[PDB]
Amino acid sequence: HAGRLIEVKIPAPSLKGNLLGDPTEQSIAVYLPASYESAPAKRYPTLYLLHGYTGTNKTWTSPEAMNIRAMMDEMIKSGRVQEMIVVAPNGWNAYKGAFYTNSAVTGNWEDYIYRDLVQYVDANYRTITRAESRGIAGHSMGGYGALTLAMNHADVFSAVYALSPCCLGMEGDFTAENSAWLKTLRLKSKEQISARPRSLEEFYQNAFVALSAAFSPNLTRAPFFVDFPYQERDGVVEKNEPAFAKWRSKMPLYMIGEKKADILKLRGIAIDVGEKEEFSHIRITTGQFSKALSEQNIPHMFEIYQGGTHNNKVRQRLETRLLQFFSEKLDFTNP
Amino acid sequence: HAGRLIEVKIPAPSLKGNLLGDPTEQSIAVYLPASYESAPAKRYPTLYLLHGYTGTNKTWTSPEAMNIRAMMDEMIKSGRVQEMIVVAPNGWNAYKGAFYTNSAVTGNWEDYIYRDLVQYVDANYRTITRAESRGIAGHSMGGYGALTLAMNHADVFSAVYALSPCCLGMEGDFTAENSAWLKTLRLKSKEQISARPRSLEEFYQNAFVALSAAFSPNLTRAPFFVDFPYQERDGVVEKNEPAFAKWRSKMPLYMIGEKKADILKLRGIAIDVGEKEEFSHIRITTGQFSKALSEQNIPHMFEIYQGGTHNNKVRQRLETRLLQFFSEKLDFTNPNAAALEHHHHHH
Amino acid sequence: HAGRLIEVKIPAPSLKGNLLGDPTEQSIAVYLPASYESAPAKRYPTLYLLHGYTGTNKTWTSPEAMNIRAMMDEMIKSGRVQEMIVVAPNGWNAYKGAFYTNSAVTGNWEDYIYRDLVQYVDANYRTITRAESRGIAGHSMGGYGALTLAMNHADVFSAVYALSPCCLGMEGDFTAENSAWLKTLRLKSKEQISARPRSLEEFYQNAFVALSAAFSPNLTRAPFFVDFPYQERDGVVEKNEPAFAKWRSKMPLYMIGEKKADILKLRGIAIDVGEKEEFSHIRITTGQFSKALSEQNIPHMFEIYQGGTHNNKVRQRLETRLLQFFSEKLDFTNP
Amino acid sequence: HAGRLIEVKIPAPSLKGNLLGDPTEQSIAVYLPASYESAPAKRYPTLYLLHGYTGTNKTWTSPEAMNIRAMMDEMIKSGRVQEMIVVAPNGWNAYKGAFYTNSAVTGNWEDYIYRDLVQYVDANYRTITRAESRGIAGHSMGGYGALTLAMNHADVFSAVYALSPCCLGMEGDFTAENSAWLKTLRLKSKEQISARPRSLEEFYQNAFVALSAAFSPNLTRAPFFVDFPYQERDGVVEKNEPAFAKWRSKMPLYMIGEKKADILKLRGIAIDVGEKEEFSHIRITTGQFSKALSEQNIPHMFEIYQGGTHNNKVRQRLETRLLQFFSEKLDFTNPNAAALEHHHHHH
């Protein structure tokens, strides 16, 4: 009944040539179910779990956090879910999160997940190598990553679950109504954003620089090598239009029309959000995202759950929704 | 272990005075779980399950239909759901369905469910008499009924599941787009709509009369005792604005602003619809209803499921979604001393 | 070493004639130190502790909250503070909080505190009946109440401590930049605000109706008997100027010029706020309030404390700052 | 139990080459708490305490001054503060005070404190050599010094307390408002400023020369080797803009934007001032400094205290505020295994 959590450094060649000094080797965590050693010919579906901004895979693996080893041991032992391998990669970068996106400044972090990571895990652990047996999920930045990766690679991942995803679209606290934007445009050096953010405002400044490096990089500008999607003119913030359209093009809410046929190849799509979600862009755009899917008649599941903040019920969502979702949607048979 | 399905005729006084000949006694089916005999102190939560238009409770009870007795026996035996009482009433009427709505022509069918029926079940079977332990659900015309009953009586039902609900709003095949409205406005007698509908046009003709009797009755207008929401002028269908407004007042999509505080008292709300739903208004308005709830930040569950038509996956939705939803949302015990103290306010 | 907490219903005649159905009798809680019965001639200074919006005195008294009986027992037993009587009144009303203010709709809640309550406690418990021996403190709505009561009645209370006070001034999330204002102006009945607020937005709508009843009541308008300080014109929120000036006149940040001489009669003034305070008007106006005092050369203490949200370190502030403050500032001798 | 105060002369190499004759060896006073002899494994946090202008460490050590030995003996005996080492250096120079600042004329007095002095104390006494266990504080010119040293060396000092700090910014009696600037610009010799200042004008004259040597030195300009921030033209005082800009660059009120990340590494920041502070610039700029920190949401403590002049309640502030502040903010043990593991990031 005891599974195992393995931590290992793997090659990350898709990150080669990034300008931020991030390494081209990266650590991951892999949960192997309890039967792995006692059933040596069995093969397992795989669930890829992505952490949020400023986070690492310790979000999932730490006993003080989600404690995925203990959770998966009990969930399997109790018969609530079938046995699957769970992979939690690090997606942290010098700006505290790369948003799982390909960028000339941060590296090809999208390629890192669907090529470097998946191919490593499949070559080293007894996975079923079919998209029908591969799921992807995440919280916040990880929900953004999960959705975009599934919409762009439905021949790699067939089921996706986004817990309170960030950056679906430009609404609420992501637009110019956020006073943090004016202070972000005025940042002079990297030392101002070096430390862990101490406040909401610092969190927004850091995230905005990270998103700019991911969505609208600039191999030339200083000090962050980014273009911002906004600009200051006469002390009023306004759209910086070329970089703004780049942001819109990376944002899944505005991608559905373009990707409808690929999205229809997914076996399962789930999105949820807490009634008490404190990031207004998440509250707003998660409902907009389900509406955009439903107006295209795309199968999916959507829930606003009572009393949930951004974080306070994520354990409950794992134990009562997300892990069950993959146990139902993934194919547990091996050809 | 084996539960029992009980069929019995019950008083339906809320139907007294209806103009259509429908009886003031009505049959119901009640599932009692397997422990009912050997646990005399035990009381159970209740799920009320409502059939669709042209249907009866045989949709739920018949062996070649959903076979609810066998389904609950197995869902409970295998531990997938906790023991609950399931009640399946008849809501069929002379126009093949009364949409669980109060009307001077059809009878007070909303009152029949939340008063006549609930009170009968609670007096004759060992139910937990708390809204927290009462749920309501239905398919199509019954999904309409479950939602409206839950929004109107959140002090009676705490959880609602609507499978491909009809009549949420006025879109698609419920509007003058539907060429059936012209033929409906020219109907001459009940004889023309007595047989079972065989085609799509006959289904719509029969349903539009039923809905008019439910939503816009007219006690003086033979032969059907209805006002239609539409009317013909030159040969083009236009709104009949006073009856039209009455239909809108009966449609949950347009009541969310008004009933918001009551909708917020429900502990569970789920709506689903098949990808291949043939009734365009169901496809359109279920998405609108979920959007309207999310715009108000109202907690709820919504699913468009792959491959489902109006009817073809109801068994699968019962077995993999609906019954487990009530097992989670309903209270299966009374609150204990620590729960009472913990649910008090400490600020 | 064991003190006692007494709960009793007292007369509240200052609330007579309020339009909200709130009773003219009100419950209070009184902490009597351990020596009360063993030293029958001793008299004690008194500390009045005010709870915040949607709260009751259970904030202070409940074992699941601040557990004032246990806290005061230990603080005294350990010698960290001298013995004082602590009085925690209820200030809750039909709109979930009266803001300790006199109003023709809510009742004379300011008079209830400094007349009804103080005179009751002095007549029934062995207090020292001198302003030099009377302190007042509160959190949020209670910090607002504490400051205004001390500035208006420095001949009753001589020392005041405001923990993260609400409603010092019109900044941040209290102005029209709060999207909750437009939805507040459109409220049609009391049933929409009857239940406990479930979300931040509901919290703002309820608070705004409560503040309007307190600051700008209207014996005639419907359904809340209030005037709002804002109004909708062409779908844009703008100042409703007569009621707006009423709000400004009740708001301590703009009162300092007028009340400087009375404020200089206070023996002690303290205001604090957490670095991570989530209500932007509190973060902004608490700093503005210390600056307004310092530019008038008014003695006072001010602290922004690392890592504190609106609530997460209030226990620590009581145990390391507030109770020590009154033990230093109040006169423990009896004439 | 009884601590000890030690007086000793130490190397001051950072002062080498100064133009004023000040020695490259400097006396300091060190308080060692009462347990120092009988707890040989025990190491202690260190508080560095800086005197004001025209003062020396006798402000802290002398029996009729603050009598720091007796004060610490009693604060520690009574349990009001934990045992710590207190270091009181001399920062007096030929102009009666060097403002703890690096200057080609006066010497590198900032380096003297954070390098020469700290390194000497750590090599000769049982200190905890972690910034988390080192604090710095001072009165007036020493409050200026403590703040600037803390903002510039947050990897050395983690907590700072400034009592009525001087020179935070250019306001009030530091500007051309002060009629003393005219008399200062006409000074002819060091002889005119050698005696102890007796009046207010003599205090300002002597201080303005000292500050010019600290903030705007001029290696070539006899007789004082300073540039003044002001100059006379027709007989009206105007800014001497290059020296003026140099003064502003030395003033903490104007460095908060630049040093923000370093200021945020301090675990404690406190500033206070008496209600009856006679130096108008101290009264004005301490309030501005607290506002400038709050505008940036920088955690800190600020107090205007009743009845206090520049000097008259320093003992009370030591005994009821400052020493207890370092007992709270400084670490008195090394971190244990659980603290190390708990301070790691788990997200």
Tab-separated table of N, CA and C in Angstrom, chain D residues 12-111:
chain	number	residue	atom	x	y	z
D	12	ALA	N	41.937	52.146	14.212
D	12	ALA	CA	40.964	52.827	13.355
D	12	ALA	C	41.589	53.128	11.996
D	13	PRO	N	42.017	52.090	11.268
D	13	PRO	CA	42.713	52.327	9.995
D	13	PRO	C	41.879	53.051	8.958
D	14	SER	N	40.541	52.954	9.028
D	14	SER	CA	39.698	53.636	8.052
D	14	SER	C	39.798	55.154	8.148
D	15	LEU	N	40.351	55.680	9.233
D	15	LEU	CA	40.572	57.112	9.391
D	15	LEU	C	41.924	57.578	8.838
D	16	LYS	N	42.738	56.670	8.295
D	16	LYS	CA	44.069	57.044	7.829
D	16	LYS	C	43.988	58.062	6.694
D	17	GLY	N	44.826	59.086	6.782
D	17	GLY	CA	44.887	60.112	5.767
D	17	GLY	C	43.948	61.280	5.965
D	18	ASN	N	43.098	61.256	7.000
D	18	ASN	CA	42.232	62.403	7.238
D	18	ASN	C	43.070	63.654	7.484
D	19	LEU	N	42.496	64.798	7.133
D	19	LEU	CA	43.225	66.053	7.048
D	19	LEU	C	43.152	66.872	8.325
D	20	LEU	N	42.449	66.383	9.347
D	20	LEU	CA	42.102	67.168	10.523
D	20	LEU	C	42.904	66.795	11.760
D	21	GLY	N	43.813	65.834	11.662
D	21	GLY	CA	44.590	65.445	12.825
D	21	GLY	C	43.920	64.420	13.708
D	22	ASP	N	42.821	63.836	13.268
D	22	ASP	CA	42.174	62.890	14.163
D	22	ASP	C	42.925	61.562	14.158
D	23	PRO	N	43.058	60.934	15.325
D	23	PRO	CA	43.923	59.754	15.440
D	23	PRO	C	43.343	58.527	14.751
D	24	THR	N	44.256	57.663	14.294
D	24	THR	CA	43.912	56.377	13.696
D	24	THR	C	43.856	55.249	14.732
D	25	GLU	N	43.745	55.606	16.002
D	25	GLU	CA	43.373	54.718	17.091
D	25	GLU	C	42.257	55.425	17.839
D	26	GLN	N	41.259	54.669	18.292
D	26	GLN	CA	40.043	55.269	18.828
D	26	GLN	C	39.564	54.471	20.029
D	27	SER	N	39.095	55.178	21.051
D	27	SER	CA	38.591	54.498	22.236
D	27	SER	C	37.122	54.095	22.073
D	28	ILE	N	36.780	52.972	22.704
D	28	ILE	CA	35.419	52.441	22.731
D	28	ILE	C	35.121	51.965	24.143
D	29	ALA	N	33.836	51.819	24.430
D	29	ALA	CA	33.361	51.235	25.676
D	29	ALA	C	32.485	50.037	25.351
D	30	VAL	N	32.677	48.942	26.089
D	30	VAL	CA	31.965	47.695	25.833
D	30	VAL	C	31.343	47.223	27.140
D	31	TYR	N	30.021	47.043	27.145
D	31	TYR	CA	29.337	46.420	28.274
D	31	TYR	C	29.212	44.914	28.056
D	32	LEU	N	29.681	44.142	29.030
D	32	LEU	CA	29.551	42.687	29.024
D	32	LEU	C	28.587	42.261	30.127
D	33	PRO	N	27.509	41.532	29.827
D	33	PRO	CA	26.501	41.250	30.859
D	33	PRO	C	27.042	40.307	31.924
D	34	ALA	N	26.240	40.159	32.978
D	34	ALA	CA	26.722	39.586	34.230
D	34	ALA	C	27.140	38.126	34.092
D	35	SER	N	26.540	37.375	33.170
D	35	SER	CA	26.864	35.955	33.047
D	35	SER	C	28.144	35.684	32.262
D	36	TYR	N	28.827	36.728	31.790
D	36	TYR	CA	29.910	36.547	30.826
D	36	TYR	C	31.008	35.623	31.354
D	37	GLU	N	31.352	35.731	32.634
D	37	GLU	CA	32.438	34.903	33.149
D	37	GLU	C	31.998	33.449	33.328
D	38	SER	N	30.810	33.227	33.882
D	38	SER	CA	30.405	31.896	34.319
D	38	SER	C	29.678	31.092	33.246
D	39	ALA	N	29.588	31.603	32.020
D	39	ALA	CA	28.960	30.895	30.902
D	39	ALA	C	29.891	30.966	29.696
D	40	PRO	N	31.041	30.291	29.763
D	40	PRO	CA	32.047	30.447	28.699
D	40	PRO	C	31.580	29.983	27.325
D	41	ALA	N	30.602	29.080	27.239
D	41	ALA	CA	30.075	28.713	25.930
D	41	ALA	C	29.101	29.747	25.371
D	42	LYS	N	28.638	30.696	26.186
D	42	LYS	CA	27.575	31.604	25.774
D	42	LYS	C	28.096	32.770	24.936
D	43	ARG	N	27.423	33.018	23.816
D	43	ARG	CA	27.663	34.181	22.982
D	43	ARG	C	26.409	35.046	22.986
D	44	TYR	N	26.592	36.331	22.706
D	44	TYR	CA	25.538	37.311	22.933
D	44	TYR	C	25.320	38.144	21.680
D	45	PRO	N	24.102	38.636	21.472
D	45	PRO	CA	23.899	39.685	20.463
D	45	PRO	C	24.553	40.989	20.903
D	46	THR	N	24.765	41.882	19.938
D	46	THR	CA	25.478	43.135	20.174
D	46	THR	C	24.620	44.311	19.734
D	47	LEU	N	24.517	45.330	20.589
D	47	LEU	CA	23.881	46.599	20.255
D	47	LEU	C	24.966	47.671	20.188
D	48	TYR	N	25.085	48.327	19.040
D	48	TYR	CA	26.018	49.430	18.841
D	48	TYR	C	25.268	50.741	19.029
D	49	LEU	N	25.780	51.603	19.904
D	49	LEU	CA	25.059	52.783	20.369
D	49	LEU	C	25.928	54.005	20.109
D	50	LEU	N	25.394	54.983	19.362
D	50	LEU	CA	26.172	56.107	18.823
D	50	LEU	C	25.740	57.440	19.441
D	51	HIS	N	26.712	58.222	19.907
D	51	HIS	CA	26.432	59.481	20.579
D	51	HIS	C	26.133	60.580	19.557
D	52	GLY	N	25.707	61.744	20.054
D	52	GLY	CA	25.346	62.866	19.200
D	52	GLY	C	26.477	63.869	18.972
D	53	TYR	N	26.126	64.957	18.273
D	53	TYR	CA	27.099	65.986	17.928
D	53	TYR	C	27.511	66.760	19.181
D	54	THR	N	28.798	67.110	19.248
D	54	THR	CA	29.515	67.630	20.417
D	54	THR	C	29.630	66.617	21.545
D	55	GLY	N	29.047	65.422	21.405
D	55	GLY	CA	29.162	64.404	22.426
D	55	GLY	C	30.304	63.410	22.179
D	56	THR	N	30.519	62.556	23.181
D	56	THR	CA	31.355	61.370	23.083
D	56	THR	C	30.610	60.204	23.714
D	57	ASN	N	31.287	59.068	23.887
D	57	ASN	CA	30.578	57.932	24.473
D	57	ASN	C	30.277	58.125	25.956
D	58	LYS	N	30.801	59.190	26.571
D	58	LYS	CA	30.472	59.520	27.949
D	58	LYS	C	28.988	59.838	28.115
D	59	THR	N	28.319	60.263	27.038
D	59	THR	CA	26.866	60.402	27.048
D	59	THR	C	26.209	59.123	27.552
D	60	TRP	N	26.724	57.977	27.113
D	60	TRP	CA	26.213	56.676	27.505
D	60	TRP	C	26.859	56.144	28.777
D	61	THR	N	28.169	56.351	28.967
D	61	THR	CA	28.876	55.633	30.031
D	61	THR	C	28.954	56.383	31.356
D	62	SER	N	28.918	57.711	31.351
D	62	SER	CA	29.222	58.444	32.569
D	62	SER	C	28.119	58.266	33.615
D	63	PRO	N	28.483	58.232	34.904
D	63	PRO	CA	27.468	57.982	35.944
D	63	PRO	C	26.367	59.026	36.003
D	64	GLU	N	26.679	60.295	35.760
D	64	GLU	CA	25.641	61.315	35.764
D	64	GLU	C	25.039	61.541	34.390
D	65	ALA	N	25.483	60.802	33.385
D	65	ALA	CA	24.825	60.763	32.087
D	65	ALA	C	23.915	59.533	32.051
D	66	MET	N	23.914	58.723	30.999
D	66	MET	CA	22.999	57.586	30.957
D	66	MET	C	23.434	56.425	31.854
D	67	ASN	N	24.695	56.379	32.291
D	67	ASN	CA	25.191	55.329	33.196
D	67	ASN	C	24.789	53.929	32.710
D	68	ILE	N	25.234	53.614	31.487
D	68	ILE	CA	24.754	52.435	30.763
D	68	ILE	C	25.063	51.142	31.516
D	69	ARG	N	26.193	51.083	32.240
D	69	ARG	CA	26.491	49.893	33.040
D	69	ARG	C	25.394	49.619	34.062
D	70	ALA	N	25.055	50.622	34.874
D	70	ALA	CA	24.015	50.437	35.877
D	70	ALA	C	22.664	50.186	35.222
D	71	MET	N	22.370	50.912	34.143
D	71	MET	CA	21.102	50.706	33.448
D	71	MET	C	20.990	49.288	32.904
D	72	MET	N	22.048	48.770	32.267
D	72	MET	CA	21.927	47.400	31.760
D	72	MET	C	21.904	46.386	32.903
D	73	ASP	N	22.722	46.589	33.948
D	73	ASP	CA	22.654	45.671	35.090
D	73	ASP	C	21.216	45.491	35.567
D	74	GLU	N	20.465	46.591	35.669
D	74	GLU	CA	19.126	46.541	36.245
D	74	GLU	C	18.078	46.077	35.238
D	75	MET	N	18.145	46.565	33.994
D	75	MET	CA	17.234	46.074	32.964
D	75	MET	C	17.334	44.558	32.812
D	76	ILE	N	18.536	43.992	32.993
D	76	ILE	CA	18.749	42.552	32.833
D	76	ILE	C	18.353	41.809	34.101
D	77	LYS	N	18.721	42.360	35.263
D	77	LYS	CA	18.360	41.737	36.535
D	77	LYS	C	16.847	41.608	36.678
D	78	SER	N	16.111	42.644	36.290
D	78	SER	CA	14.664	42.670	36.470
D	78	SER	C	13.914	41.940	35.368
D	79	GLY	N	14.618	41.351	34.408
D	79	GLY	CA	13.982	40.626	33.331
D	79	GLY	C	13.373	41.469	32.236
D	80	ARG	N	13.612	42.785	32.225
D	80	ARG	CA	12.991	43.627	31.209
D	80	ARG	C	13.656	43.452	29.849
D	81	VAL	N	14.953	43.109	29.822
D	81	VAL	CA	15.672	42.812	28.584
D	81	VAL	C	16.554	41.588	28.800
D	82	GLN	N	16.852	40.889	27.709
D	82	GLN	CA	17.756	39.754	27.731
D	82	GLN	C	19.204	40.254	27.667
D	83	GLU	N	20.134	39.414	28.108
D	83	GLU	CA	21.544	39.802	28.128
D	83	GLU	C	22.065	40.063	26.723
D	84	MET	N	22.670	41.234	26.532
D	84	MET	CA	23.302	41.577	25.266
D	84	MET	C	24.560	42.383	25.546
D	85	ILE	N	25.466	42.390	24.576
D	85	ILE	CA	26.672	43.210	24.668
D	85	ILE	C	26.328	44.563	24.076
D	86	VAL	N	26.737	45.632	24.745
D	86	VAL	CA	26.516	46.985	24.250
D	86	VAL	C	27.870	47.628	23.986
D	87	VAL	N	28.033	48.190	22.790
D	87	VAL	CA	29.277	48.826	22.360
D	87	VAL	C	28.986	50.297	22.103
D	88	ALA	N	29.739	51.182	22.762
D	88	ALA	CA	29.589	52.632	22.589
D	88	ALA	C	30.898	53.237	22.084
D	89	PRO	N	31.032	53.459	20.780
D	89	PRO	CA	32.267	54.039	20.238
D	89	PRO	C	32.301	55.556	20.324
D	90	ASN	N	33.508	56.096	20.226
D	90	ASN	CA	33.662	57.529	20.018
D	90	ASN	C	33.596	57.838	18.526
D	91	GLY	N	32.828	58.864	18.177
D	91	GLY	CA	32.749	59.365	16.813
D	91	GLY	C	32.985	60.864	16.762
D	92	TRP	N	33.557	61.385	17.842
D	92	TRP	CA	33.951	62.785	17.914
D	92	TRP	C	35.169	63.012	17.014
D	93	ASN	N	35.246	64.191	16.390
D	93	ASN	CA	36.413	64.547	15.564
D	93	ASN	C	36.746	66.015	15.799
D	94	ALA	N	37.704	66.533	15.012
D	94	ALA	CA	38.222	67.882	15.242
D	94	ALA	C	37.140	68.949	15.140
D	95	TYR	N	36.082	68.686	14.375
D	95	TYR	CA	34.956	69.603	14.254
D	95	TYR	C	33.798	69.225	15.177
D	96	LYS	N	34.072	68.380	16.182
D	96	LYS	CA	33.195	67.965	17.274
D	96	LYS	C	32.179	66.912	16.851
D	97	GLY	N	32.403	66.256	15.706
D	97	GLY	CA	31.505	65.206	15.234
D	97	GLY	C	31.606	64.948	13.741
D	98	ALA	N	31.817	63.691	13.353
D	98	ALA	CA	32.016	63.335	11.949
D	98	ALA	C	30.785	62.735	11.277
D	99	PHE	N	29.663	62.624	11.995
D	99	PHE	CA	28.388	62.107	11.466
D	99	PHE	C	28.520	60.718	10.834
D	100	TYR	N	29.489	59.914	11.312
D	100	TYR	CA	29.584	58.483	10.979
D	100	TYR	C	29.547	58.251	9.465
D	101	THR	N	30.162	59.167	8.722
D	101	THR	CA	30.110	59.235	7.264
D	101	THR	C	31.522	59.181	6.681
D	102	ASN	N	31.669	58.558	5.495
D	102	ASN	CA	32.962	58.509	4.801
D	102	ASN	C	33.249	59.834	4.087
D	103	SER	N	34.463	60.363	4.262
D	103	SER	CA	34.818	61.655	3.684
D	103	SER	C	36.331	61.738	3.498
D	104	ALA	N	36.758	62.292	2.359
D	104	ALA	CA	38.185	62.400	2.088
D	104	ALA	C	38.880	63.336	3.063
D	105	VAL	N	38.139	64.239	3.700
D	105	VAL	CA	38.717	65.153	4.683
D	105	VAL	C	38.685	64.558	6.093
D	106	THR	N	37.533	64.061	6.550
D	106	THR	CA	37.429	63.630	7.943
D	106	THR	C	37.920	62.219	8.187
D	107	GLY	N	37.984	61.395	7.152
D	107	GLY	CA	38.220	59.974	7.300
D	107	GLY	C	36.990	59.164	6.924
D	108	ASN	N	37.203	57.856	6.753
D	108	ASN	CA	36.099	56.945	6.393
D	108	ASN	C	35.383	56.450	7.655
D	109	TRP	N	34.600	57.355	8.246
D	109	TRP	CA	33.962	57.072	9.535
D	109	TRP	C	32.827	56.059	9.411
D	110	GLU	N	32.175	55.972	8.247
D	110	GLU	CA	31.214	54.889	8.042
D	110	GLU	C	31.927	53.541	8.066
D	111	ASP	N	33.070	53.443	7.362
D	111	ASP	CA	33.856	52.211	7.395
D	111	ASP	C	34.358	51.911	8.802
